[PDB]
Design a binder for these strands. Structure first.
Ligand SMILES: [Mg+2]
Ligand SMILES: [Mg+2]
Ligand SMILES: [Mg+2]
Ligand SMILES: [Mg+2]
Ligand SMILES: [Mg+2]
Ligand SMILES: [Mg+2]
Ligand SMILES: [Mg+2]
Ligand SMILES: [Mg+2]
Ligand SMILES: [Mg+2]
Ligand SMILES: [Mg+2]
Ligand SMILES: [Mg+2]
Ligand SMILES: [Mg+2]
Ligand SMILES: [Mg+2]
Ligand SMILES: [Mg+2]
Ligand SMILES: [Mg+2]
Ligand SMILES: [Mg+2]
Ligand SMILES: [Mg+2]
Ligand SMILES: [Mg+2]
Ligand SMILES: [Mg+2]
Ligand SMILES: [Mg+2]
Ligand SMILES: [Mg+2]
Ligand SMILES: [Mg+2]
Ligand SMILES: [Mg+2]
Ligand SMILES: [Mg+2]
Ligand SMILES: [Mg+2]
Ligand SMILES: [Mg+2]
Ligand SMILES: [Mg+2]
Ligand SMILES: [Mg+2]
Ligand SMILES: [Mg+2]
Ligand SMILES: [Mg+2]
Ligand SMILES: [Mg+2]
Ligand SMILES: [Mg+2]
Ligand SMILES: [Mg+2]
Ligand SMILES: [Mg+2]
Ligand SMILES: [Mg+2]
Ligand SMILES: [Mg+2]
Ligand SMILES: [Mg+2]
Ligand SMILES: [Mg+2]
Ligand SMILES: [Mg+2]
Ligand SMILES: [Mg+2]
Ligand SMILES: [Mg+2]
Ligand SMILES: [Mg+2]
Ligand SMILES: [Mg+2]
Ligand SMILES: [Mg+2]
Ligand SMILES: [Mg+2]
Ligand SMILES: [Mg+2]
Ligand SMILES: [Mg+2]
Ligand SMILES: [Mg+2]
Ligand SMILES: [Mg+2]
Ligand SMILES: [Mg+2]
Ligand SMILES: [Zn+2]
Lengths: 50, 60, 114
RNA sequence: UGAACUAUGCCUGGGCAGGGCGAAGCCAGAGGAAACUCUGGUGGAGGUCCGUAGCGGUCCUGACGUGCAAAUCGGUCGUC
RNA sequence: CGCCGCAGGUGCAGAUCUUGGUGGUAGUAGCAAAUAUUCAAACGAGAACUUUGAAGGCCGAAGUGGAGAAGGGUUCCAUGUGAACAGCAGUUGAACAUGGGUCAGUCGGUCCUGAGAGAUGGGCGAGCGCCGUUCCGAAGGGACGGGCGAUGGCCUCCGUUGCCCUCGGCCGAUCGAAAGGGAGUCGGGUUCAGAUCCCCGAAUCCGGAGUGGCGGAGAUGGGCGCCGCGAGGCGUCCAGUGCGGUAACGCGACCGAUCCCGGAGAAGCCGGCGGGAGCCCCGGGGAGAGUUCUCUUUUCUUUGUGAAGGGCAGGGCGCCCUGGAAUGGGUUCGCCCCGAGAGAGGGGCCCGUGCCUUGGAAAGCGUCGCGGUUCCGGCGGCGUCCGGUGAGCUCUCGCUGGCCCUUGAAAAUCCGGGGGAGAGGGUGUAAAUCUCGCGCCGGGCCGUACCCAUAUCCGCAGCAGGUCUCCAAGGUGAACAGCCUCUGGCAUGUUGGAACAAUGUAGGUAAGGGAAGUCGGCAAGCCGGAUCCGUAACUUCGGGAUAAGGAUUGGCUCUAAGGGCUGGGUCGGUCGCGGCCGGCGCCUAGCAGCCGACUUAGAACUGGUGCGGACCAGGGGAAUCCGACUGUUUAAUUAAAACAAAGCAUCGCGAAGGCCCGCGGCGGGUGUUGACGCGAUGUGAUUUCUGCCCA
RNA sequence: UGGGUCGGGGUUUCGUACGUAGCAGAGCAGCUCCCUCGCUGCGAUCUAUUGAAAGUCAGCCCUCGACACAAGGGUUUGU
RNA sequence: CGACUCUUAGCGGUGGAUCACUCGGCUCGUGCGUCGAUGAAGAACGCAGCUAGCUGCGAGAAUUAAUGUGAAUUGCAGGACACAUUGAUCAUCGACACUUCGAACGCACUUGCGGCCCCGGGUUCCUCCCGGGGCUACGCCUGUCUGAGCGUCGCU
């Protein structure tokens, strides 16, 4: 809602900041084995815990 | 417009800006951004030009 | 017709969400949130049902910033008791004290016999 | 571990077109020898009636029945 | 890997076996709930679907509109992409990628308590702990007052500190509401996205000020001796914690503590009236548009003044003074009121959201132009006017009623009064003090974007489901009905094209007959609004009842009836073609002028008997059974005759108690209770009865 | 020569169009040097023009009027 | 003549069996056998030039110091780094530091609000506003101070 507490807002901010693609230079590292961020969360598909 | 520590209040922001930029400020408005960083709108006193201050800071 | 919206996040028609229509200089109708209707003091006699005269009817916390004259009447018990019941209390006090003197005189004259 | 659904109590809020009938109380007139009666108004009661919104869910044993839906939809309906 | 030995988690077709993959079905079912699209152009490789324009439609203010709560959490906003996703496509996207965006003393949270939750003391408990919330506590850590002192210093003198005296029950921590209570912010502008928060301009609340910021108030008079021509000054005394009105009460302040009293906060549902506003409607005047085949001085749009002050209307008063009323009077839609003081006259107070005014026209808006700063709060002109109506709608304020075996919070917080402990100065250009005017400083923390739903929430999903609210135009009409339209919105609900077979789903019609169909009139049909008539049995006398039954209804042209405001003067007898008093006259069966809503009744004329022309909108009657009624019920097959109910009857109980909970505590619920009450049963309104049997 | 598309005519359906005019019309509002029974409006409806108007093959009938188009395209086939 | 269907084979798809591999497990054994109010375990939020996860770390934040080592780190960039008036990286780890919750400690939390003592500023000492620092939980032992009792006594 518009009314939210500071803890809820900060939790949402962290979940926002970690919902981004991997940097492209990561895949050039030695022995990477990572292709794409598998922890991507879309707002409509998967809902947050809180 | 500044990005400030989320734990700093308006008085602290005002005093910090005054001390480390040698300017006098009129008021401070404060919000916390959706990414969690605090943003401060610091209006300067009428006898200080925010354009010149931003030029000295180097953010033009 | 131009329809209206609430200007605050309270969306329910509660007793603290009461409005009136205002026409701004911009020729638009907006809501103005009104204050509650105040009440004049009731009399401390607790008998007659009318509310006191000479006193502004405002919300209780507004009385802090009113001057003294606006809150009381220039009389004994002024602003706390009605004039009629003040008159009644004056007469009642005087006459009951007179009756006390009567019984005092009566026993003083009756004690003359052993 | 659960009363975010539901059941019940409590607290604090919000809400319910338009019509019909016409309870007490009241006014006047008329008839009577009286007792009293009759008549016309006024009034606006009620777990009152018709009927929206709301709430419910009668029948079609209608639709659908690998559905729009793990109970929904249409008309007709109960209360309002 | 062979051979000799050794050791096994050692051999699969099955177990509706486990996991993974793949077929036929099958290019099949299907992409059919809510009326609907079309033309041109642009961009583009590509257009039924994107964008612009034009047209035709829909939602039709109880919206497919504009905003919120909860929930979501970046979906918001730009730019770009065209992998996958958006069950067709896409140049589009709530997708993907990159950036950006939420600004507060006065909007909330925060504070208060509510139902309740919950520590401590105590009690229990093997124990984690749990019971309990004033109960079995030494539960006040505070206070202007006074004293004892340290003088800490601008040691004059008042603020400081320690101790003592006196006073001191929220008698219970703490938590509990983004809808309860709760001081104080509005107008204009501004963005791609934020604004009651930014900017501009106007306010306002609370808090503070020790050295006291300025004023004003307190408060500056009276007597006597004098001086002095007098005025005006001098000196000794004396007052002085304001003043007015008969009153209601008023004035700009108007000393005062502990303590006590009271008020406000602080109250339900419903009815009927009245005031105010916004909206709607009517008549003109402007400005801009539309029509002009013909007519229409026409039709549409538009035509402001916030908060906070001041004044004045208007509304209300169970407020005062005079006076004393029956031949009772006043008065409401209803009522109701009066020797406990009517009517009448004169005042007082409250609310004042209305009008005028400061704000304020400088802004805003509409128009007509001229300059540009690639995208100026540009410049300029003109205007922003005058009226009328009302059972109209919606808010609001008030008055007066009704209902209740129902009586409809609490606490923060603020204020008034009673009392008078004290304080302040010796007549000074004075003191204590001041709720008066102005001035100075400050108001931290968190939330704030967007969606709020036939696509941003929950239902596995862009799911016909569910999900709390506020605003609410014109016509018809009884109407927030249905139907059409304006503002605003949309693209037909996850595809299009071509046909028009059966069978379906939804909707109609049907000659003659009229339930012969069927378990059964299921389904459909009939009736339907309003006006005028007229209505039975039965009945608990209230009902039945819209019983039943009959007539009428259009259009046009009139006619009557139903109102409100003003003015009713006989005269130059004179001069403030006008005014102070009087010889000077009889509307007293009331007129004269103007203005304005609908509604009713009657009549004529008229149409191919059609007229509640769509929409809205009861089929009716005679009985039997059951349940009295209204109410409730098996969410997802049973709405009933079942449950409930009032009424009736019985039982237990006087608190060391009845009934009940509890592992436990003399723990807890009924119980903030007390036999007209609690608890436990049966039957089920009314009426009428309720027989016999205690083996 | 052809079949189309318009047009025309026929058939048929409904029922008498718009406009104009009338000393038609219940009446009503204005003008009376006017008028001598008059003149200007509003007025449902009526009468004439007018068995008119409109539709009619899209799966009706006949045209010999007008207009343009019609040796054209593609895929196959042998005892 | 072809289609279609079936069988077989070549090739190509779909699929991921088999085999080979193995910085993982499972089992046994050994030696130690160590948390915490000096604030644990656990949780939250942050921290990199480009960094989402994992890992590491704590506002000194993919780490400081110190010691050992001895020329790298690396995906890109950048700049170091005389390797002796000392040094990249890594390892070790004894110095320093270590945000917020949490036994979690001023009171309370899905929010927020205090009190006391110092220091600095606006004040221009007097107490208001701002900032900084230190305290302010419960139980309990020893001692200390202040006390209470018509508890038991002494003296007056
Ligand atoms: Mg969802
Ligand atoms: Mg803020
Ligand atoms: Mg106004
Ligand atoms: Mg619930
Ligand atoms: Mg009812
Ligand atoms: Mg009903
Ligand atoms: Mg069925
Ligand atoms: Mg095996
Ligand atoms: Mg097998
Ligand atoms: Mg076998
Ligand atoms: Mg198909
Ligand atoms: Mg289909
Ligand atoms: Mg419509
Ligand atoms: Mg909406
Ligand atoms: Mg698709
Ligand atoms: Mg968007
Ligand atoms: Mg995205
Ligand atoms: Mg106490
Ligand atoms: Mg609280
Ligand atoms: Mg509130
Ligand atoms: Mg917005
Ligand atoms: Mg004005
Ligand atoms: Mg009177
Ligand atoms: Mg102007
Ligand atoms: Mg918003
Ligand atoms: Mg839906
Ligand atoms: Mg789920
Ligand atoms: Mg949809
Ligand atoms: Mg459709
Ligand atoms: Mg479509
Ligand atoms: Mg038939
Ligand atoms: Mg028939
Ligand atoms: Mg039969
Ligand atoms: Mg038969
Ligand atoms: Mg039926
Ligand atoms: Mg009947
Ligand atoms: Mg007629
Ligand atoms: Mg029943
Ligand atoms: Mg019965
Ligand atoms: Mg039910
Ligand atoms: Mg059921
Ligand atoms: Mg059922
Ligand atoms: Mg009975
Ligand atoms: Mg009973
Ligand atoms: Mg017996
Ligand atoms: Mg023809
Ligand atoms: Mg193969
Ligand atoms: Mg080092
Ligand atoms: Mg709270
Ligand atoms: Mg003793
Ligand atoms: Zn009284």
């Amino acid at each position: 809602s518009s009314h939210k507490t500071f803890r809820i807002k900060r939790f949402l901010a962290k979940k926002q900041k970690q919902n981004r693609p991997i940097p492209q230079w990561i895949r050039m590292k030695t022995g990477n084995k990572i292709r794409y961020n598998s922890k991507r969360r879309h707002w409509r598909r998967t809902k947050l815990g809180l | 417009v500044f990005i400030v520590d989320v734990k700093a209040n308006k008085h602290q922001i005002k005093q910090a800006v005054k001390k480390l930029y040698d300017i006098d400020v009129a008021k401070v408005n404060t919000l916390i951004r959706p990414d969690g960083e605090k943003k401060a709108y610091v209006r300067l006193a009428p006898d200080y030009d925010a354009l010149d201050v931003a030029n000295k800071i180097g953010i033009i | 017709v131009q329809r209206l919206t609430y200007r605050r996040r309270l969306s329910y028609n509660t007793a603290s969400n009461k409005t009136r229509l205002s026409r701004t200089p911009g020729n638009r109708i907006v809501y103005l949130y009104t204050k509650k209707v105040g009440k004049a003091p009731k009399s401390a006699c607790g008998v007659c049902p009318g509310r006191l005269r000479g006193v502004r009817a405002v919300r209780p916390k507004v009385l802090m910033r009113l001057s003294k004259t606006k809150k009381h009447v220039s009389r004994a018990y002024g602003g706390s008791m009605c004039a009629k019941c003040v008159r009644d209390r004056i007469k009642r006090a005087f006459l009951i004290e007179e009756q006390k003197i009567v019984v005092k005189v009566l026993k003083a004259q009756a004690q003359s016999q052993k």
